[PDB]
From a paper:
The protein SidK, secreted by Legionella pneumophila, interacts with the V-ATPase to inhibit acidification of the phagolysosome in the early stages of infection. V-ATPases pump protons across a phospholipid membrane using energy from the hydrolysis of adenosine triphosphate (ATP) to adenosine diphosphate (ADP) and inorganic phosphate. Successful pathogens can subvert host defenses by secreting effectors that target V-ATPases to inhibit lysosomal acidification or lysosomal fusion with other cell compartments. This study reveals the structure of the V-ATPase:SidK complex, an assembly formed from the interaction of host and pathogen proteins involved in the infection of phagocytic white blood cells by Legionella pneumophila. Removal of the C-terminal residues 415–573 of SidK did not significantly affect V-ATPase inhibition by the SidK mutants, but truncations of the N-terminal region of the protein has been demonstrated to prevent V-ATPase inhibition. These data show that binding of the N-terminal domain of SidK to the V-ATPase is responsible for its partial yet specific inhibition of V-ATPase activity.
One SidK construct, consisting of residues 16–278 (SidK-N), yielded two crystal forms that diffracted X-rays to 2.3 to 2.4 Å resolution and the structure of SidK-N was determined from these crystals. The first crystal form contained one molecule of SidK(16–278) in the asymmetric unit and the final model included amino acids 16–274. The protein has an elongated and slightly bent α-helical structure consisting of three α-helical bundles. The three α-helical bundles contain four, four, and three α-helices, respectively, and are connected by loops in the bundles. The first α-helical bundle (α1–2, α5–6) also has an extension nearly perpendicular to the bundle axis that consists of two additional short α-helices (α3-α4) (green arrowheads). However, the N-terminal bundle with its extensions, which from previous analysis was proposed to be the region that interacts with the V-ATPase, does not resemble any other known protein structures. The monomeric SidK predominates in solution, even at high concentrations, and therefore the elongated monomer structure is expected to be the functional state of the protein. Only the N-terminal region of SidK interacts with the V-ATPase and consequently a highly-elongated SidK structure was unexpected. Mapping the contact surfaces in all three SidK:A-subunit pairs in the cryo-EM map to the SidK crystal structure, the main contact surface appears to involve residues Gly24, Tyr28, Phe62, Ser85, and Trp122 from the first α-helical bundle of SidK.
Numbering used by the authors: 0, 16 to 275
Write the structure that this text describes.
């Protein structure tokens, strides 16, 4: 009996704490407007017994099932903001993304939810992943994924975002011994995406250098002359992995075929 209204007070506070975690500076006026009937009981110095009585007498929203459904929506919005960190979504997009989540007929079978699930699976795997070429490839693309979700959201049709999910999950499914398949996937991604330097501002400068060295060290054993070896080493001066760099390596690899039958 009194346990139920204690749950109502708890759920009211949980929603407010979720809102405070998302928006501590009170910038999301539209989302807070949707929850003002709940938030008001936590931003005034009501004591527990007062909110408990407010639930017993109906002065606050006291349908526990309805409060939980509203809470899960806000929890999914917080997960979106948390899952893209260290990248940040602008205020108006946070609120428009919330509106899409709120208005969905079944949010928990939507691709918004499934995309968040699979994004978290990538970041979870990367937590304790050894710095192999495969995982460095995956970390680079997962970071681009987070940045594109922060810019475009998680609800609209985006072939770039789906391709990053696809290629990222494929790297995770690849065996550590399928080296040529890992590089073919990664090189293929950089060539097929539209940005000339798709990792600048997204990866740390040292991570970009490691990617450059990974491409050089992969192609170097194939070369059959010092002249072509020197041309490839001349490319290792680049601190950024660009589409141009990859094409310049492929031209050297192509020239090497003239020295082989």
């Amino acid at each position: 009996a009194e346990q139920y209204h204690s749950q109502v007070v708890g759920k009211i506070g949980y929603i407010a704490r979720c809102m405070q975690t998302i928006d501590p500076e009170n910038n999301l006026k539209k989302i807070r407007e949707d929850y003002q009937d709940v938030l008001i009981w936590a931003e005034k110095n009501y004591r527990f017994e007062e909110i408990l009585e407010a639930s017993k007498s109906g002065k606050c929203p006291n349908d526990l099932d309805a409060l939980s459904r509203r809470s899960l929506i806000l929890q999914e919005l917080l997960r979106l903001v948390s899952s893209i960190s260290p990248f940040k979504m602008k205020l108006d997009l946070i609120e428009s993304q919330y509106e899409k989540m709120k208005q969905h007929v079944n949010l928990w079978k939507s691709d918004y939810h499934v995309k968040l699930n699979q994004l978290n699976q990538l970041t979870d795997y990367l937590k304790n992943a050894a710095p192999t070429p495969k995982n460095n490839f995956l970390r680079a693309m997962t970071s681009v994924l987070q940045m594109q979700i922060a810019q475009y959201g998680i609800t609209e049709d985006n072939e770039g975002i789906n391709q990053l999910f696809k290629l990222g999950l494929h790297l995770l499914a690849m065996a550590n011994e399928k080296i040529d398949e890992q590089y073919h996937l990664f090189k293929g991604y950089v060539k097929d995406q539209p940005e000339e330097s798709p990792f600048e501002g997204i990866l740390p400068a040292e991570d970009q250098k490691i990617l450059v060295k990974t491409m050089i060290d992969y192609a170097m054993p194939k070369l059959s002359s010092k002249v072509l070896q020197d041309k490839l080493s001349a490319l290792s001066s680049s601190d950024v992995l660009t589409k141009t760099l990859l094409d310049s390596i492929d031209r050297i690899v192509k020239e090497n075929e003239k020295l082989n039958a």
